[PDB]
Write a protein that binds this ligand. Structure first.
Ligand SMILES: N[C@@H](CCC(=O)O)C(=O)O
Ligand SMILES: N[C@@H](CCC(=O)O)C(=O)O
Ligand code: NA
Ligand code: NA
Lengths: 239, 238
């Protein structure tokens, strides 16, 4: 239900937690985050419960790394539990997701035949294993995500990262909002601009069907056929 | 003329240079910056001429480090030259300064007598040598600055760092404006809030006579008797 992501030189865990504090929708049930450092070391922490519980856990095990994604969940598929909380993983592929993957069943079956173990009951987890699958077929994360997204049906927003290549985040808007926040030598993404105001006031709103490749220094947006599209940045005057 | 400073986890050179670009409208003859990394390695680059010239040189000497100060100068003491541009140094003490130190002559002679060599013709350089002097007497950078400031007369603002302890910046407002910009796990300072808008919208204005010690995580403000004062932070989108 709430997504925040960041790709920066500085540690982003505190920015992600502050973003989640700004995305605490009535009835959400769990929260989690994953950060990866420059050497590809990933730390993921999830909790059934409130962002404050996650924040307290993060205080104990300080999470270093300039690339990360975080999520508050409002469960639709799978009961609230830490196992089902986001980020979900498929080895090096880490995903957070808002909305629903309608065709999760057939997809889950295909991936199971490809040798993938599902550990959660969520529709989300199919996104992770599928991008893992596509990436195995060769190409960059952007290319794999371009192949993946058409296979997914439903109303969703997702941000994906590959812990082996922590210099890029991929994001796709396909029935649920996402907005990019532009920083200086760092970039952010959230499902609501309100999450990002502490660190930037300049935004690019993704449009329906947009897939964005975000690095510390560049934002490149494409549609599903892989065509590059131009989206305007705007300065927000909200406090 | 324009001052920008930053103390962050990320490299700050780009933020400093952008801050200077935002200050060019005030006019200036030279500009410079200094950044220090976590290990105390200081890189200083100065140019007679435009910020764009400095930014170009920075592109060849990519400056790494999370603590730094930068300045555009409008010369009052000493002709425009790279030697007279700030930041000025005294070994590990590095200073940028707006305004004038009216009593620079007596202090310069005093510090010359004390063994310092002045490389520049600026009043500014006395600040660097004086803080270096006071620090030799013992204490923290904050303590040394508290002892230095009362010796200076003039209408000025200054930001000071010690490359040996890159986790703190000291700033003193004594007749020329300075504003702190509050970030998340980083803090900034400038002579004009316009310099800081790209990175934050929350500010604390230093009041006359305030001496601030700024770290990545905290801002502690004192008066000249060393008393802690509380200043209000305000949000200001321009
Ligand atoms: N359907 C996903 C995401 C729900 C949401 O948008 O929070 C889940 O149940 O985990
Ligand atoms: N008096 C100092 C500072 C001038 C300024 O405020 O730019 C100098 O001449 O370098
Ligand atoms: Na869709
Ligand atoms: Na004064």
């Amino acid at each position: 239900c709430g997504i925040v992501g960041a790709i920066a030189q500085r540690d982003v865990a505190e920015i992600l937690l502050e973003g989640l504090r700004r995305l605490e929708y009535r009835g959400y049930d769990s929260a989690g985050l994953a950060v990866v450092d420059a050497e590809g070391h990933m730390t993921r922490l999830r909790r059934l419960g409130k962002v404050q519980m996650l924040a307290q856990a993060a205080e104990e095990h300080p999470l270093h790394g300039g690339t990360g994604i975080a999520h508050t969940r409002w469960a639709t598929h799978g009961e609230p539990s830490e196992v089902n909380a986001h980020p979900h993983v498929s080895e090096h592929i880490v995903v957070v997701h808002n909305g629903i993957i309608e065709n999760h069943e057939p997809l889950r079956e295909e991936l199971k035949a490809r040798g993938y173990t599902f550990v959660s009951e969520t529709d989300t987890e199919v996104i992770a294993h599928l991008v893992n699958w596509e990436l195995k077929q060769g190409g960059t994360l952007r290319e794999a995500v371009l192949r993946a997204i058409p296979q997914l049906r439903g109303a969703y927003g997702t941000v994906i990262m590959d812990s082996r290549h922590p210099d890029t985040l991929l994001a796709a808007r396909s029935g649920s909002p996402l907005v990019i926040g532009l920083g200086m030598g760092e970039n952010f993404i959230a499902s609501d601009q309100l999450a990002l105001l502490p660190v930037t006031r300049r935004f690019i709103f993704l449009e329906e069907g947009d897939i964005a490749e975000i690095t510390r220094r560049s934002v490149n947006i494409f549609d599903k056929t892989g065509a590059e599209v131009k989206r305007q940045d705007i300065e927000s005057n909200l406090q």
